[PDB]
Amino acid sequence: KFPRVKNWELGSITYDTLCAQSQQDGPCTPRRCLGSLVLPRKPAEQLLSQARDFINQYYSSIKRSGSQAHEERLQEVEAEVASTGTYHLRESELVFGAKQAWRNAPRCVGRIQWGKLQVFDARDCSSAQEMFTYICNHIKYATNRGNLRSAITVFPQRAPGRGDFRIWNSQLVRYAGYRQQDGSVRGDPANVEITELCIQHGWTPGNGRFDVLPLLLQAPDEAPELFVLPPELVLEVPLEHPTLEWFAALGLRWYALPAVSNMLLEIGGLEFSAAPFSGWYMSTEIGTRNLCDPHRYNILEDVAVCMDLDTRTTSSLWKDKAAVEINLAVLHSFQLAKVTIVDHHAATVSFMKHLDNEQKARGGCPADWAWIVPPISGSLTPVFHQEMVNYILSPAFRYQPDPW
Amino acid sequence: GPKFPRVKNWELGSITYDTLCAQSQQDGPCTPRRCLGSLVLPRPAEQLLSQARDFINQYYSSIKRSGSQAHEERLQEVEAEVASTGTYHLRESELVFGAKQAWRNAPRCVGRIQWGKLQVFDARDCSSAQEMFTYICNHIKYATNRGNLRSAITVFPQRAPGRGDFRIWNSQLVRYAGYRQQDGSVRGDPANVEITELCIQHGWTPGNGRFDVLPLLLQAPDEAPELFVLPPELVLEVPLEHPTLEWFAALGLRWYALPAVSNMLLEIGGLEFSAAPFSGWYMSTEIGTRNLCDPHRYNILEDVAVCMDLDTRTTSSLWKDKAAVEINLAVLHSFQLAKVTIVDHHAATVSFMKHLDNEQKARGGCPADWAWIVPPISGSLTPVFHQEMVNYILSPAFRYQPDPW
Numbered sequence: 001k002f003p004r005v006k007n008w009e010l011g012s013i014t015y016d017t018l019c020a021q022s023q024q025d026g027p028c029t030p031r032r033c034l035g036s037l038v039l040p041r042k043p044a045e046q047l048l049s050q051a052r053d054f055i056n057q058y059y060s061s062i063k064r065s066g067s068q069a070h071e072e073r074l075q076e077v078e079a080e081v082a083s084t085g086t087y088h089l090r091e092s093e094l095v096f097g098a099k100q101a102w103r104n105a106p107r108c109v110g111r112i113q114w115g116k117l118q119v120f121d122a123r124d125c126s127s128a129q130e131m132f133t134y135i136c137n138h139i140k141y142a143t144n145r146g147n148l149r150s151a152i153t154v155f156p157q158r159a160p161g162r163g164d165f166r167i168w169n170s171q172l173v174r175y176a177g178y179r180q181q182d183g184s185v186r187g188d189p190a191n192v193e194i195t196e197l198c199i200q201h202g203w204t205p206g207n208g209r210f211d212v213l214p215l216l217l218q219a220p221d222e223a224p225e226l227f228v229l230p231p232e233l234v235l236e237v238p239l240e241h242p243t244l245e246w247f248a249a250l251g252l253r254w255y256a257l258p259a260v261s262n263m264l265l266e267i268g269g270l271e272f273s274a275a276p277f278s279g280w281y282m283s284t285e286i287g288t289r290n291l292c293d294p295h296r297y298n299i300l301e302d303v304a305v306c307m308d309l310d311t312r313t314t315s316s317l318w319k320d321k322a323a324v325e326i327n328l329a330v331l332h333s334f335q336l337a338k339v340t341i342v343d344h345h346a347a348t349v350s351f352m353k354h355l356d357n358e359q360k361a362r363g364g365c366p367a368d369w370a371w372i373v374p375p376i377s378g379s380l381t382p383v384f385h386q387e388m389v390n391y392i393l394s395p396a397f398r399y400q401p402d403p404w
Numbered sequence: 405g406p407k408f409p410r411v412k413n414w415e416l417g418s419i420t421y422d423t424l425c426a427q428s429q430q431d432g433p434c435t436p437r438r439c440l441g442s443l444v445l446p447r448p449a450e451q452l453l454s455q456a457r458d459f460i461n462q463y464y465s466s467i468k469r470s471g472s473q474a475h476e477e478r479l480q481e482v483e484a485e486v487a488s489t490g491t492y493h494l495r496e497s498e499l500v501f502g503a504k505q506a507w508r509n510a511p512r513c514v515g516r517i518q519w520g521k522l523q524v525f526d527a528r529d530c531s532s533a534q535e536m537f538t539y540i541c542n543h544i545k546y547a548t549n550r551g552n553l554r555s556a557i558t559v560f561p562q563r564a565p566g567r568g569d570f571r572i573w574n575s576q577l578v579r580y581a582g583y584r585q586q587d588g589s590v591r592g593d594p595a596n597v598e599i600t601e602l603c604i605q606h607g608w609t610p611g612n613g614r615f616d617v618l619p620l621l622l623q624a625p626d627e628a629p630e631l632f633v634l635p636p637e638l639v640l641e642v643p644l645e646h647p648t649l650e651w652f653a654a655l656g657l658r659w660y661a662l663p664a665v666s667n668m669l670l671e672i673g674g675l676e677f678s679a680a681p682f683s684g685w686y687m688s689t690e691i692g693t694r695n696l697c698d699p700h701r702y703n704i705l706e707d708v709a710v711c712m713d714l715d716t717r718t719t720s721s722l723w724k725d726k727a728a729v730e731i732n733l734a735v736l737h738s739f740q741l742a743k744v745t746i747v748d749h750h751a752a753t754v755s756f757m758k759h760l761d762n763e764q765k766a767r768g769g770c771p772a773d774w775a776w777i778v779p780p781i782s783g784s785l786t787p788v789f790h791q792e793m794v795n796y797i798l799s800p801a802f803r804y805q806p807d808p809w
């Protein structure tokens with residue numbers, strides 16, 4: 001029926017009834033659970049039913065369901081689809097839709113903030129150059145001299161029989177990965193492919209471990225264009241450790257603004273192929289995943305040797321000890337630089353509060369346990385002991401294929 | 405391409421497909437509309453025979469005699485046995501194969517690399533509570549082997565139609581008492597409050613330490629559970645010290661050497677073994693992180709953090725992370741120093757990756773519960789974190805069963 005949901009630290013029990021509002025299939029079946037997969041394996045009446053549903057959500061949200069404005073707006077959408085095969089959102093609807101998509105993102109531990117989202121309408125964009133302007137303003141607004149603010153910029157929706165607006169980069173700010181033919185990678189190995197694409201479209205590359213990539217922006221059915229971000233827009237933080245004086249000598253640094261730029265935003269059946277969004281980092285993303293993942297910067301050993309740890313055996317927990325100091329360094333360095341950041345304990349604590357708010361407001365909260373639980377110190381955080389139900393609600397952020 | 409779940413490792417870039425999940429006969433809790441994978445407990449002669457037939461087929465396949473005369477005869481013999489009695493009985497070597505296959509099939513166990521080397525003690529002749537005690541003692545002695553731990557399971561008589569179950573009431577063969585205090589707090593292990601009060605109701609004279617070993621509550625068919633005290637010499641324990649933090653030994657912490665799950669039901673070919681305790685050896689995080697640091701367990705994080713002089717007033721000091729690491733180190737160090745088998749979370753997950761590759765070759769997949777396979781500290785530091793997994797129920801299986809009270 002409805003999932004009985006238990007917190008094992010407190011003994012408390014809720015029931016998720018919100019999951020019944022799911023109109024889209026995830027990857028699981030009763031025969032096997034596929035909840036740990038990162039990516040999904042893969043007319044007019046369909047659009048119209050998604051359209052009416054969203055419009056209903058919207059007017060419900062402003063406490064005007066049934067109103068004259070509500071019924072009229074349904075007919076507008078209905079008349080537009082019947083004639084054209086599609087329709088258009090009003091800005092206020094778009095602002096709401098973007099917020100709900102964030103709110104519905106089962107993987108996001110930052111959703112306590114969902115009601116506080118600056119939404120830039122960039123639907124009047126006609127060129128890659130214009131996209132760059134918008135993106136530049138997004139970054140300036142979002143960065144705010146280190147007092148980070150959540151923001152999204154929405155570019156023109158997809159249209160039948162026309163190429164998409166796309167930002168080719170996976171993030172607005174990311175470091176290059178230069179493949180040296182001696183097998184290794186200088187920089188971020190996660191970005192080798194995007195770095196190569198940039199070079200091939202005429203970018204002159206560097207040879208550092210932290211070269212900020214240029215943007216590849218694509219207007220419909222046009223080759224993408226290359227744009228170098230003004231260095232004064234890309235706030236970065238030098239990494240140092242509060243006690244380990246040698247740590248700074250590693251030359252490590254990270255950027256302030258995390259901004260996902262390759263996800264698709266779906267509202268009322270409309271799809272926005274370019275809708276980059278930014279918030280602020282939770283520290284483990286940088287300290288654990290970006291810096292310690294074996295397929296990323298992979299600095300664990302370097303730090304562990306500097307700490308004179310025993311790298312010979314697993315049972316000395318050198319990896320665990322190194323990781324902790326690296327995350328400490330990130331938190332310290334960001335705090336010293338007055339750049340917004342949240343540690344995983346604060347983050348998960350606020351998410352629990354969010355789970356509680358959502359239970360009262362909607363009867364549940366879609367959450368992906370494997371992503372909510374931080375990459376270090378799992379059971380040391382409250383979300384570890386909290387059962388979670390995972391499902392797709394719309395509006396939603398989706399993955400979409402790389403445009404190349 | 406293929407009509408099977410595609411499984412990816414994101415560290416290595418490699419791809420497999422799970423074909424083994426196609427042999428699953430029992431549904432888990434998920435649907436296309438919502439994933440319940442993170443939930444701890446998710447909610448006739450014909451049914452018996454088809455399950456019996458399945459297991460017999462599995463057995464004969466394993467010894468490469470599928471289709472043989474002996475295979476068809478065993479099939480007919482099981483069928484005729486069920487037809488006259490309503491149940492049937494396993495041959496010893498069938499019981500051995502099934503026990504190992506149940507372990508092999510356990511999606512949550514990171515220790516499955518060892519599945520082939522289980523020692524199976526056949527106790528299907530056991531006819532009393534006193535006798536269960538003897539078998540359990542023998543199990544503990546054999547499995548402990550003075551610190552050089554050996555995997556083992558002891559199998560007691562199956563559920564019989566119109567007969568009471570053999571049940572061990574304790575969740576583990578060795579566990580510490582949890583004494584509810586007048587102030588609302590708990591002396592010992594809070595996990596074990598109920599079982600402690602059940603032992604008292606049944607005549608146990610309770611201690612009052614943080615680490616009092618519980619007596620066993622053993623139940624032979626249609627009889628009241630009887631109380632049995634484990635002789636302390638049989639119960640090997642390890643005092644906890646830290647290799648550089650000299651004060652840690654003064655915390656007076658300890659843990660028992662032998663982990664032995666005693667309240668799970670072993671299901672094979674539709675037969676149900678309601679008492680079949682199994683033991684292995686600990687992965688260090690089980691002790692250092694879960695048992696010692698869980699808020700609702702011993703909860704020693706703050707104490708240790710204070711001893712280390714950390715800033716426990718703010719999350720961003722990572723005082724929890726720091727303490728937790730030192731506690732896990734202490735567990736590993738102490739067990740090594742006492743020469744008691746233990747495996748850290750790195751070694752364990754590496755060995756599990758190897759297991760996954762073995763099983764890919766051997767069966768075309770391996771059912772696995774990501775949330776349980778990933779350790780509770782240092783998650784993405786271990787290789788399994790970056791390994792997608794497919795979770796599904798295969799039989800023979802270990803399954804939860806309601807508490808007998």
Ligand code: HEM
Nearest residue numbers: 102105107108109110113150277278279280281282371397
């Ligand atoms: C404001 C502070 C925020 C914090 C601290 C935060 C934190 C996180 C974290 C830790 C993840 C895990 C995924 C990963 O490891 O990359 C995540 C995922 C995600 N977040 Fe947030 N987030 C924030 C803001 C936002 C905003 C403003 C949006 C959109 C409007 C958003 C939407 C999403 C989505 C769609 C995912 C899933 C991405 C994927 O599946 O690859 N978050 N977030």
Ligand code: HEM
Nearest residue numbers: 507510512513514515518555556682683684685686687802
């Ligand atoms: C040999 C060394 C072994 C190691 C290191 C090991 C490790 C683990 C760990 C860490 C878990 C996580 C469950 C928890 O947190 O409580 C687990 C679960 C499990 N293990 Fe093992 N195990 C070993 C041997 C065995 C044996 C011999 C059996 C049975 C014959 C077994 C059957 C199971 C089962 C059924 C579960 C799931 C329990 C549940 O769902 O509550 N394991 N194992």
Ligand SMILES: Cc1cncn1-c1nccc(CCNCCCc2cccc(F)c2)n1
Nearest residue numbers: 038039108110171258259260277278279280
């Ligand atoms: C800006 C933001 C707000 N919330 C999270 N982020 C955020 N910031 C920075 C980075 C990310 C990563 C989001 N998930 C992306 C990784 C998932 C994958 C999907 C396909 C292929 C891959 F290699 C990896 N998220």
Ligand SMILES: Cc1cncn1-c1nccc(CCNCCCc2cccc(F)c2)n1
Nearest residue numbers: 444445513515576663664665682683684685
């Ligand atoms: C002996 C062994 C072999 N493999 C694992 N173990 C092992 N040893 C010692 C302990 C455990 C715990 C296994 N899972 C225990 C069940 C945890 C729960 C599940 C639901 C409700 C609860 F209160 C508690 N496993």
Ligand SMILES: C[C@H](O)[C@H](O)[C@H]1CNc2nc(N)[nH]c(=O)c2N1
Nearest residue numbers: 036037038370371789790791792
């Ligand atoms: C296989 C597994 O699902 C995958 O590695 C996930 C696990 N949890 C994660 N959690 C976060 N926050 N980010 C991630 O990229 C992942 N990766």
Ligand SMILES: C[C@H](O)[C@H](O)[C@H]1CNc2nc(N)[nH]c(=O)c2N1
Nearest residue numbers: 384385386387442443444775776
């Ligand atoms: C809520 C969550 O499912 C629960 O705490 C699970 C998560 N993973 C686990 N993993 C292991 N190994 N042991 C556990 O008890 C749990 N508990």
Ligand SMILES: [Zn+2]
Nearest residue numbers: 028033434439
């Ligand atoms: Zn699932």
